[PDB]
């Protein structure tokens with residue numbers, strides 16, 4: 263197909279990662295506000311967190327589908343050996359990062375499930391410590407995905 267489909271896919275992937283970043287920052291803010299302060303207030307922050315997780319998992323499945331589409335079109339386009347190898351290296355790194363994000367979201371879901379089973383400051387602290395590190399790793403993954411998508415637009419000459 264054309265290079266315009268390549269651009270449209272890369273742009274939709276960019277919009278997804280930007281929405282994912284917004285959602286992660288909202289969840290970080292609500293978790294910080296709770297800890298900087300109540301039992302029903304925790305039920306509240308946990309419910310809003312679980313909603314961010316749902317949206318984030320939907321956006322990931324959408325991004326993985328668009329990546330498969332990008333890989334297929336790049337395969338169909340008769341690129342030079344050098345450009346193909348460059349594009350393929352980047353696509354493999356992106357597949358690794360999307361896999362890392364899925365595993366991180368699984369850990370976050372398990373952690374939320376475990377905390378819902380408890381009444382306690384020490385427990386809430388240990389839990390906030392794990393959540394901070396996961397959110398920080400998530401931010402790192404999103405930033406690298408954003409950079410790699412820009413590299414692709416650049417290697418293709420679409421930026």
Ligand SMILES: CN(CCO)c1ccc2cc(/C=C(\C#N)c3ccc(C#N)cc3)sc2c1
Pocket residue numbers: 278279282286289311314315318319321322325326360362363364366367370371373374392393394396397399400401403404
């Ligand atoms: C530690 N916590 C708190 C749990 O109570 C959370 C909560 C929500 C959450 C959501 C996460 C999402 C991503 C990551 N990473 C992600 C999504 C889409 C794409 C793409 N395209 C790429 C990445 S990570 C994460 C962590």
